[PDB]
């Protein structure tokens, strides 16, 4: 299983789990924008503090624009091995292709860590 | 589109307070009551027969 073309770094299992946990915590006690349209809208608006992107998305054009945009706007972005897991972390039955944390809520320490652990990935 | 047009005048303008009928409404000093509705509440209002 070759990684999708938009992939720029390999996320460890623990780091993906922490990203999903931050998504859950930001849903509960913060704000997460669900769906890639609102993800791009917030990242363009600059209100996103982290971007979680699925890896098993069959049409890669949905998430082909998220890595370079995120590197353009200096908003850290992280990957998760499944969009079903991202929908579960976001509390929506449909598979959440991507999630944009606006208010980390009680995930701040995680996101601040995750971003740092994202900041070592492209290095 | 579903909003009734605003009628200040005409039979449609005034509706009975109690039963809402668009027909006979008594407006002597601000009742807004259907003529049927008046008979059952006149004693409550203090009206007496003489």
């Amino acid at each position: 299983m070759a990684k999708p073309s938009y992939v720029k770094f390999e996320v460890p299992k623990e780091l993906a789990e922490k990203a999903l946990q931050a998504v859950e915590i930001a849903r509960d006690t913060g704000k997460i924008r669900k769906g890639t349209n609102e993800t791009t809208k917030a990242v363009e608006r600059g209100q996103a503090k982290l971007v979680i992107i699925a890896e098993d998305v069959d049409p890669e054009e949905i998430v082909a624009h998220l890595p370079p945009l995120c590197e353009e706007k200096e908003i850290p972005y992280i990957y998760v091995p499944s969009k079903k897991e991202l929908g579960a972390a976001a509390g929506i039955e449909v598979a959440a292709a991507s999630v944009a944390i606006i208010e980390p809520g009680k995930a701040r320490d995680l996101v601040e860590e995750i971003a740092m652990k994202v900041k070592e990935l492209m290095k | 589109y579903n909003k009734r047009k605003p009628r200040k005048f005409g039979k449609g303008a005034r509706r009975c307070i109690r039963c809402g009928q668009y027909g006979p409404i008594i407006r002597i000093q601000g009742l807004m009551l259907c003529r049927h509705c008046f008979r059952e509440v006149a004693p409550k209002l203090g009206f007496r027969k003489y």
Partner: protein, 102 residues
């Protein structure tokens, strides 16, 4: 000299008489000239309506009435005298309106 004019309007006759008597009894206790209660005309609201809810049968009419009575009490200027009138217990059906004429 300054005069205080009190209009007392009510459907109930006896409540009107009670309030007027209360003001009167306050008057000579306070020792201030108090012109006697003048009973103005009693206004008679009359409403005539057909009895029949439907249209069938003989045409019959019912005439309902309100008689609202009104008395005028003029009193002279003494702050003690006009202080003792907000303390009056006033029944619900009686309405008092007090103005001040030079």
């Amino acid at each position: 000299m300054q005069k205080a004019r009190i209009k007392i309007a009510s459907t109930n006759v006896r409540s009107l008489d009670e309030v007027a008597n209360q003001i009167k009894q306050i008057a000579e206790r306070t020792g201030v000239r108090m012109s006697g209660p003048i009973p103005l005309p009693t206004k008679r609201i009359r409403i005539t309506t057909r009895k029949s809810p439907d249209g069938e049968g003989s045409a019959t009419f019912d005439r309902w009435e309100l008689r609202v009575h009104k008395r005028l009490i003029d009193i002279e200027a003494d702050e003690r005298a006009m202080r003792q009138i907000m303390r009056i217990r006033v029944p619900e059906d009686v309405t008092i309106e007090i103005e001040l004429i030079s």
